[PDB]
Point group: C3
């Protein structure tokens, strides 16, 4: 792969920590509820949850590095801003999940579009699209299996929240940026 093992591990850990914060926010606000008592939990989440999101973070970053022209001008400052934007949007969905679906979903779409406008390129958007489809699909399957459920006022997309689509999209854009950063920050002459 294009990522070095150490970079992949850092990205995995970054995704896992952000996932735990966001997922705890969803649980504590009643946005979601788990129904899987048999597995070990880490904070408010089944142990496999931060593993899934962490793995997706490293995978989307790797994917970007296989797409045309990774940007060499990416900085830690841009990456911090992107992570903050995704974390901020994630926790905001926990705060507003009980409100009507259109304004809630529109707000998250606006946040995602602005994140792309500031940080994203074409291949980054493509990564955003990939996870905007796979992310909600995995969740829909999990909900179907009874692993967890969304609050009844946040389950309009086949049992999951419509805001997942732009939330995952923004995640993909930023993970792609993190992959570009991993390469760009390597030692130079």
């Amino acid at each position: 792969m294009r990522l070095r093992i150490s970079e992949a591990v850092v990205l995995f850990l970054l995704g896992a920590v952000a996932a735990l914060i966001g997922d705890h926010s969803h649980v504590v606000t009643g946005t979601t509820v788990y129904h899987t008592d048999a597995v070990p939990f880490v904070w408010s989440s089944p142990f496999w949850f931060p593993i899934l999101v962490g793995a997706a973070t490293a995978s989307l970053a790797e994917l970007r590095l296989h797409l045309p022209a990774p940007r060499d001008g990416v900085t830690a400052r841009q990456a911090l801003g992107g992570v903050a934007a995704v974390v901020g949007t994630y926790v905001t969905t926990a705060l507003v999940h009980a409100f009507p679906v259109v304004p809630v979903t529109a707000l998250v779409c606006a946040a995602a579009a602005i994140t792309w406008c500031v940080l994203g390129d074409g291949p980054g958007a493509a990564c955003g699209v990939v996870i905007a489809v796979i992310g909600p699909a995995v969740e829909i399957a999990l909900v179907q299996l009874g692993v967890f459920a969304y609050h009844p006022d946040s389950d309009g997309l086949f049992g999951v929240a419509p805001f997942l689509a732009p939330l995952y999209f923004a995640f993909g854009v930023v993970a792609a940026l993190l992959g570009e950063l991993a390469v760009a920050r390597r030692p130079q002459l």
Copy 2:
């Protein structure tokens, strides 16, 4: 006019779609209520509402092109970001309309100032001022006529919401940017 018909139509449609999303958000949250049963509705709005906002969008864009030095460096990326900022702010007012007037209005003013800081110039601000006056004035007249009303906790500006002033201001700044974009994106040598 400086805009070509096709550009004016695209801007009109853009404004109309964004207006319908925002106005549906206000209606579904109880920010506003219509009292005009005799006219055809489009989604949650009287059919003339998206026409008014769409027309204002094309008109403010046209106005900018009659003001000094339209910027030739404007991009679709900046325009998407501006539309997202205005849509995001519009739907946020629906979410927070029941809160006390000062923090709500201050939040919208902050959003509008940041939108200008990132995207606006002097003439863009002037367009923002024009609609920040005309917009609320039209609404105040409509409310006076009994066409619709604001929620009692959001009607402190002669029967309409004080947040309309910075919301319209930000709309004007972005419409002006869209006018500049319309010209800048034309085919070049």
Copy 3:
């Protein structure tokens, strides 16, 4: 000092006005309650409150000018954006203070990180750290003395809100920027 008296006064007034707006927002939403009837109030605040924040604004700006390489490229546009970001974040804490501590605090941390990413440098962050410690410390002492109290759902940091840490941090970053602006905007050849 590096600031001229007139610049220090403008910064003091700017901080005082923003403090009064934010503090009124906290009082009117029940985020905080004062228990000091013997002193003259200005709007919703004890008269010494805007003096404290105004003084901190001028002091942090002055401090930045004693740290390495004040940036000469700072503009009024950047400064307006920074003030808007801090005011917007301040009033948002009033709106969301009743929600669970983790998502609320994470949202404010995200806002602060983005503010730094867009506007801050190393010395600006250092100023942010200074007030992120001193600010909450002063508040903790004041609460201990019974001068005011936080809402029971917003008092987890020794009697004050955990969101104060990133809120003050962002304040420090922007005050530092205002100090740089004060010097940069002086008449040039």
